[PDB]
Amino acid sequence: HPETLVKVKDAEDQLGARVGYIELDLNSGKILESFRPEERFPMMSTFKVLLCGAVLSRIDAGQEQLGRRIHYSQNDLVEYSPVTEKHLTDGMTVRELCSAAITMSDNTAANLLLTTIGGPKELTAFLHNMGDHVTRLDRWEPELNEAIPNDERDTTMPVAMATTLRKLLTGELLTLASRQQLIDWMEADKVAGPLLRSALPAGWFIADKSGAGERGSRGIIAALGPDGKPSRIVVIYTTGSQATMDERNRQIAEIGASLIKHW
Numbered sequence: 001h002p003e004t005l006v007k008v009k010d011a012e013d014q015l016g017a018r019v020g021y022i023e024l025d026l027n028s029g030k031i032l033e034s035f036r037p038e039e040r041f042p043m044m045s046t047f048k049v050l051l052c053g054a055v056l057s058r059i060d061a062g063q064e065q066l067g068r069r070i071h072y073s074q075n076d077l078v079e080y081s082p083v084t085e086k087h088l089t090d091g092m093t094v095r096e097l098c099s100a101a102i103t104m105s106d107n108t109a110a111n112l113l114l115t116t117i118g119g120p121k122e123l124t125a126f127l128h129n130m131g132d133h134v135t136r137l138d139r140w141e142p143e144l145n146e147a148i149p150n151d152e153r154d155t156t157m158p159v160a161m162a163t164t165l166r167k168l169l170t171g172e173l174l175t176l177a178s179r180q181q182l183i184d185w186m187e188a189d190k191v192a193g194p195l196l197r198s199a200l201p202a203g204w205f206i207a208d209k210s211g212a213g214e215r216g217s218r219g220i221i222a223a224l225g226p227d228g229k230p231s232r233i234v235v236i237y238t239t240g241s242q243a244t245m246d247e248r249n250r251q252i253a254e255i256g257a258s259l260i261k262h263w
Contacts, residue, residue: 044211
């Protein structure tokens, strides 16, 4: 609805930064609303959904196991590892690592899983293979959040990320069982409460993943809808603001409120 674009523009005004936005119909794949849909933005922790999609694809092909246990040490821990730092002694399974990465945005979990699939270039290759020739992962955590102006490393485009997510959650790429496991992790978010979830009415569905990084970078990807089922994909990215985290959170939530009002 164009009134939502009014709010996105206002958000750019308020944050003094570019905001990229897309609304995509889950069923048909039709673009409903867009703003800077083909500009590149840092993905930040939203890549973690793609990462676990690649892992689940390996599990579907028999080349990985959800129950496989991964061992690591204190040498592997990077900033913001609230779950992995607790399990140094006995390690964690792949399943537990994807849960930690998506529901808590644990950075070391993401690194460990990236190791298991062959690094950022294999994730990039997985994406290319499913028709996303835009999204690219180049670095590991936490360097991939650097958000250098004009840097293409570790970026996506709102339209690219939206169509890739639709493919993951609805296409033939993953088994139905894996698809649902992915949705389940994203539904169980524990860190994205002040963003879209704060505008979401009672009984609606949401499966999401947020991110933050340097240079005022902030973002969220989500599948959401009334009556307990997802019917649209929304992606919002911003970078370059000097604004506080609370101010950034508020602008994204207000975009969410407008999208919901004019649904």
